Design a protein around this nucleic acid. Structure first.
Lengths: 139, 180, 50, 124
RNA sequence: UACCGAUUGAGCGGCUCAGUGAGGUCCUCGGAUCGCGAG
RNA sequence: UACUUUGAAAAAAUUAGAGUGUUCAAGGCAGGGCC
RNA sequence: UAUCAACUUUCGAUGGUAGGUCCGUCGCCUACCAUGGUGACCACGGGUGACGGGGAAUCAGGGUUCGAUUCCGGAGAGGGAGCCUGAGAAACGGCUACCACAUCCAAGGAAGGCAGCAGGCGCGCAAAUUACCCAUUUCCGACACGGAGAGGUAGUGACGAAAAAUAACAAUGAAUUGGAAUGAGUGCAUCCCAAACCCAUGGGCGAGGACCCAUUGGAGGGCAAGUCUGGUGCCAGCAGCCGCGGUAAUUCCAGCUCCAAUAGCGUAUGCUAACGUUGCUGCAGUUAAAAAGCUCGUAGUU
RNA sequence: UACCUGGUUGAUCCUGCCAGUAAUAUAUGCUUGUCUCAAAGAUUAAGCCAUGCAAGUCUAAGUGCACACGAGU
């Protein structure tokens, strides 16, 4: 059990500090890993250049083709697979364009039936993808 | 280094439950009954009560005859009786925990000018305050949330320049008189 | 395949909106919201079509 | 209609002034100018408007009363010595120079590169 | 997606061994030059 | 000598908080009354 | 942080003595001796997307997180080092070197330091005018007089905080009608302010779809809100999660309607409460993750 | 305000996490009529800088035989 001694503040402080590393949520934010492997490097959004136009298939029991894009970031040159959210917005995307990608819902976790996509496109050609979908800023 | 203060505090707080049906009904009931513009004015007057109740709740923790409780307690009680939200008969620190949000909503300027018969409805009361019609002791007030105190209760009347009281007609009164 | 990007959104018959009257905003919208939900009574939802 | 009250009053006689808070009333007129206040304030103290100085008039919300500060002197020469250069310029008693601040700085730095009597030539 | 892997793998940084050591500061004396002294 | 209580001492700003109708408020540290 | 358990001490590490040096104390340094000093109560070494603190965010109580940032102290002016002047500097809007970078040149030479105020480039998800004045606040100087990008005032600004329009009042069965009511805006005076600007006070224009039009996300559940209509047919797309789309979709694409907050609101990533899922208050270890195979044994705790 | 809700099963009671919920930080999408207050090249780059400016300074009282002047300026 616990040591309730009046001079056990050192034993309690050392035990609690060590057991916090067995927490998955704590060891992820207080280590070099999970941040060096993070392509964004701890940022909210990121800009990149579109390399290809790949379509990943949704996992079971779903059946569809997710319109994704192979993007290479600028600040570190890493290759990520963003997601073009809305309907037909992949046509607004052209290869070798400047797109502002961001996270996808869950932090560093694949959202929905998409196999390994954990990012999504926010802007393209320095204009927002949402305005292109609503008939504004025709680009 | 600049000669500024950068002090600023919020006056409301959003509820924990965003779509609680039991809460939306009682807040909308307060809006229509007192003629409020949005839910922020409801959360503001609730936050105002929460500050007073928390201040009194701290004094109930302190024992009686305490120099801090007797001073700050009597100062808070006389401050509530000044604005009229607390009666003079029973001014104790434990009756502050029996105050409702409706007590403060009755001391606003739009509700007082409506109770004094100067306005037709509560919504008609707010529109004429923003139009520089009523005053309080020779002071024209343009704010509907003016917390009227008891010393300025019998001094709320129309301004000396408004057509409702004694003054020149409006821009549309003489406009129709010139054309015909 | 990527050959069907923007398929249903292009096949939907383009129907534009209608020229409707303006709406009260601010205190006036809350007034209409109040006297409709509490004053004017006499269960179905606000948008129940049944 | 227009009425000056001079709520407070004090005679310090160190700067040869009579400091006072000028509270002018106007229940149906616009903000009364300082020229009208200054001329009707000297006749209250039996003097000339050339020694009266009023400023800082902030009309209250709604209208009816405008409050400000006021100073009167014993003579005109004391006004030119105690009053700042910008209050005298509001009257016909002072005129500010025409050169800009950006020009004086550049003229100074150009003179720092020339030593001798030629320093005044390069500056002008 | 990480791991092992010959390639004395490669690149970029931190602190240092040794050698070389600019430039000041002091200490010894050195006297262009100036009117025993200043230099 | 630990504990406990008291006193001394302590940068302000900030926080809490007294007073004060910037038209109300966030705030400010000012300003109120009489001829 | 132990996947750092011994470290320091030829070449000062601990101490003693004499001296040198400094404004002065001291291994601060030198010379001669002594063999010490630190460490399981975590030394030493490494890491820090570490300047410290006054504080900030969120909190029932305890806590968790943040603090480059206007106040105090420290540190540095491209990287290190050396010195001059002076009461005060190891000064860089002082100087002398090397290193990196870079400017002019008759190619002999000369000169440079915006982590000052504006501004440019680069970097990026990410941050404003090559503006005005020394009038306020104070500082410096032979001085009541000069100077001050320190500072103050404007410009940019949905970082945020407070107040607060987008209608009100009456008859008639609604872009129906009816007269009233002040703002937005717009000029003109005054006020304001070093001149200006903003607010405020007046009077002259200023609303009937008071066309002077409120957006932003949702309407299967969680979670307030359509067994509606058309289109698509596991396609396109929706969905934080569970799921929806398999020709009669309340979940997709739209129309209508409705709901929520509102001059705001959605999203992404951190952070806090949720979380008694880090449990000191306050968690667990028979079978769901879990008591060393067992016993002895010092520090530690009791 | 000392608060919980969805999700393992044919159904149930649990451990448990994932997801929801509400503040606060910067960034960003869309949108904006008044008035007040106010942060603002910190995060990657103590990266590089064109140009202007940012520290100068007289009293009756340390010197003061040019200007312009009846000593003073």
């Amino acid at each position: 059990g616990k040591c309730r001694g009046l001079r056990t503040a050192r034993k309690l402080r050392n035990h609690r500090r060590e057991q916090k590393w067995h927490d998955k949520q704590y060891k992820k934010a207080h280590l070099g890993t999970a941040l060096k492997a993070n392509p964004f490097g701890g940022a909210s959004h990121a800009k990149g250049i579109v390399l290809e136009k790949v379509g990943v298939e949704a996992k079971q029991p779903n059946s569809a083709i997710r319109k994704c894009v192979r993007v290479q970031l600028i600040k570190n040159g890493k290759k990520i697979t963003a997601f073009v959210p809305n309907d037909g917005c992949l046509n607004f995307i052209e290869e070798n364009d400047e797109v502002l990608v961001a996270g996808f819902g869950r932090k560093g976790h694949a959202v929905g039936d998409i196999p390994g996509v954990r990012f999504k496109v926010v802007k393209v050609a320095n204009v927002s993808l949402l305005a292109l979908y609503k008939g504004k800023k025709e680009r | 280094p600049v000669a500024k203060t950068w002090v600023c505090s919020k006056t409301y707080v959003t509820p924990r439950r965003p779509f609680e049906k039991s809460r939306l009904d009682q807040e909308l009931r307060l809006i229509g009954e007192y003629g409020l513009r949005n839910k922020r004015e409801v959360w503001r007057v609730k936050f105002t009560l929460a500050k007073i109740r928390k201040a009194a709740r701290e004094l109930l923790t302190l024992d009686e005859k305490d120099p801090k409780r007797l001073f700050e307690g009597n100062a808070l009680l006389r401050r509530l009786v000044r604005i009229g939200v607390l009666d003079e008969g029973k001014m104790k620190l434990d009756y502050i925990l029996g105050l409702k949000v409706e007590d403060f909503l009755e001391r606003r300027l739009q509700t007082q000018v409506f109770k004094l018969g100067l306005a037709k409805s509560i919504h008609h009361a707010r529109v004429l305050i923003r139009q520089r019609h009523i005053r309080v002791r020779k002071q024209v007030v343009n704010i509907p949330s003016f917390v009227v105190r008891l010393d300025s209760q019998k001094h709320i009347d129309f301004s000396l320049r408004s057509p409702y009281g004694g003054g020149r007609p409006g821009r549309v009164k003489r406009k129709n008189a010139k054309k015909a | 395949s990527l050959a069907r990007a923007g398929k249903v959104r292009g096949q939907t018959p383009k129907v534009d909106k209608q020229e409707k009257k303006k709406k009260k905003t601010g205190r006036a919208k809350r007034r209409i919201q109040y006297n409709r939900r509490f004053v004017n009574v006499v269960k179905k939802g606000p948008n129940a079509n049944s | 209609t227009v009425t000056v009250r001079t709520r407070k009053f004090m005679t310090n006689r160190l700067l040869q002034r009579k400091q006072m808070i000028v509270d002018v009333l106007h229940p149906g007129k616009a903000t009364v100018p300082k020229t009208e206040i200054r001329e009707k304030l000297a006749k209250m103290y039996k003097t000339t408007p050339d020694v009266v100085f009023v400023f800082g008039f902030k009309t209250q919300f709604g209208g009816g009363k405008t409050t400000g500060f006021g100073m009167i002197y014993d003579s005109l020469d004391y006004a030119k010595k105690n009053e700042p250069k910008y209050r005298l310029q509001r009257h016909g008693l002072y005129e500010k120079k025409k050169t800009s601040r950006k020009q004086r700085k550049e003229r100074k730095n150009r003179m720092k590169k020339v030593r001798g009597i030629k320093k005044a030539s390069v500056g002008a």
